[PDB]
Amino acid sequence: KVFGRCELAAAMKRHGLDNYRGYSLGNWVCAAKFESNFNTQATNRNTDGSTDYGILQINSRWWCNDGRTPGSRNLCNIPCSALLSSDITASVNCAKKIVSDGNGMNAWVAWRNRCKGTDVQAWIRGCRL
Template sequence: MARAFYGVLCFLLLSVVLLKNAEGRNLTRCGLTNELMNLGFDRTLLGNWVCLVESESGKKTDKMKKKANGSYALGLFQINSKEWCTFDKKGGKCDMKCEDLTNDDISDDSRCAQKAFQEMGFRGWEGWMRSCYGRKLPIPNC
């Protein structure tokens, strides 16, 4: 009982810290497409990236979801805190603060997502596997 209480308390405190530091935004499909193109995403894979973001975060830059293993999926690409970032200081495979994944600047999120993609491909994202795998995903017409 006490353990559950402390777990909830920690989650609430972490949420407050992230919300305080986050200035998230909700992107439109065309806004997302244009930003990804401007950030140098491979044009031939753009349909996959847009589908991934739509299925993972609903195009919300400040999305945070607690995972069953105690880690968090963060930001536009729902990057996992277990491997890719560290709270309160730079760290993880992306050498970044997890809090930076939930603000409105998606340039650092994009670099981290591309690094994760190089290691795992799109199959590393549950949302992509569930909603995008095996579908024809053209570049959104904007």
């Protein structure tokens, strides 16, 4: 599913992300924009042989099982394919574990490089959440 901007923000709010570990909703929408272009089916392979899945490009090395990432963990206890569903629950729940891990949203490199420090509020403006 490709989400519209306001549609994803509403879904994120409903699914418990707004101010989760101190991160306003606009942070999560901005991250999703640059990670996946709001597309739940986005995949991208990394040079280490891991793959990033879904609207927040959750990586197979630590967080989900894809059966092709040698020496990896499955900390969210899910198949990575669950992260590609039009229902975002799995991606949200796994993101809550990631963001709680110590480095906050810096775990998302595109967040650090493109959202951190910016006017993230703009990503939710105009939206009826």
